[PDB]
Design a protein around this ligand. Structure first.
Ligand code: NZM
Length: 326
């Protein structure tokens, strides 16, 4: 069977990843590029050393939020008109707080601004066991059986052990662990009209058997919300691509070092798809411990996402949906 890898995309992803890691004087980085319609793995790139894309568990951080928001919409726990109070709070020593105090936000705003408070409130409308099953259905804790040695399953703690604060902090991506490949896979539920794809290392003549996570209508509405992330007002404007609308999500995760979360060491993540309305490509970028030129997901991982996505669309012959201006 024809290998799914596209050499030009692989080269592009590798070169842009290593350029970004150098520019930000980071420890390491990883990129996954997927066919958004059939789940072909087009590129898997790493900084020198092991195949971190498949071997390394990371916390998804705010890259989990699109799924929580989609689930809440899908189940009718919220809608596109609700305006949620998003003031911060604590339970005991644990804060539930955003980068800024947003007094209130609608679901679009929660996505756009990356509101931990907003996402936690939507998650809290579901029971713990329901959320556990949901995360497991996204593939968290479920090995890909890629064939690569040292491949990780990720980690999903048994729901019977969860404190109520833990369900909340999981909704903005603490505690959950998965590889970047497992995380990129999850995004196929949003691009492939609600249906999670298994991913493939060979070209597929038709979409393989998947599993429905969301209604098609939910997936379509969520993709539209995610375009807010790359437009003025969003966290991820650095990932906007000339000629296209891009649905994306940023993540900035405190690193866990010496038994505690560090306040000044982070992992920067940017995951997105285009064309947003009718997606063809998913690009996932993570940069571990940037020490120069910033640390926010949008600022650090946005620019390489932009280059890799723009280049991939061109390589694949996908036409711009709006006039070019660059
Ligand atoms: C999303 O990733 C979410 N991030 C956090 O809540 C985390 N840390 O915040 C940064 C800090 O210094 O406290 C976090 C989640 S899991 C983990 N280990 N850390 C929000 N998203 C973004 C973003 O890029 O979209 C943020 C940007 C600064 C922080 S809040």
């Amino acid at each position: 069977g024809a290998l799914s890898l596209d050499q030009r995309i692989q080269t592009l992803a590798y070169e842009e990843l290593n350029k970004a890691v150098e520019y930000h004087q980071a420890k390491a980085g990883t990129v996954v590029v997927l066919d958004a319609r059939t789940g072909e793995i087009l590129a898997l790139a790493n900084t020198p050393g092991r195949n971190r894309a498949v071997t390394d568990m990371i916390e998804p951080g705010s890259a989990i939020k699109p799924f929580v928001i989609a689930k809440a919409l899908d189940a009718g726990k919220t809608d596109l008109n609700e305006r949620l109070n998003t003031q911060p709070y604590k339970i005991g020593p644990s804060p539930v707080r955003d980068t800024h105090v947003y007094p209130s936000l609608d679901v679009r705003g929660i996505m756009q601004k990356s509101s931990n408070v907003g996402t936690s409130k939507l998650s809290a409308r579901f029971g713990a066991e329901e959320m556990y099953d949901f995360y497991h259905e996204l593939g968290i804790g479920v090995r890909m059986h890629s064939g690569f040695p040292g491949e990780t399953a990720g980690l999903l703690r048994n729901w019977r052990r969860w404190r109520p604060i833990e369900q909340a902090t999981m909704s903005f991506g603490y505690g959950l662990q998965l590889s970047l490949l497992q995380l990129a896979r999850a995004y196929t539920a949003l691009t492939h009209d609600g249906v999670l794809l298994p991913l493939s290392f060979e070209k597929q003549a038709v979409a393989p058997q998947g599993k429905r996570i969301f209604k098609e209508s939910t997936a379509r509405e969520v993709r539209n919300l995610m375009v807010s992330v790359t437009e003025p007002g969003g966290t991820g404007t650095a990932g906007a691509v000339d000629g296209f609308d891009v649905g994306a999500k940023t993540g900035t995760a405190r690193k866990f070092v010496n038994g505690r979360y560090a306040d000044n060491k982070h992992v920067a993540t940017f995951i997105g798809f285009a064309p947003a309305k009718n997606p063809r490509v998913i690009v996932a970028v993570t940069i571990d411990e940037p020490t120069a030129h910033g640390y926010y997901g949008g600022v650090v991982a946005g620019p390489p996402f932009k280059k890799i996505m723009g280049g991939s669309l061109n390589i694949l012959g996908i036409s711009p949906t709006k006039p070019l201006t660059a």
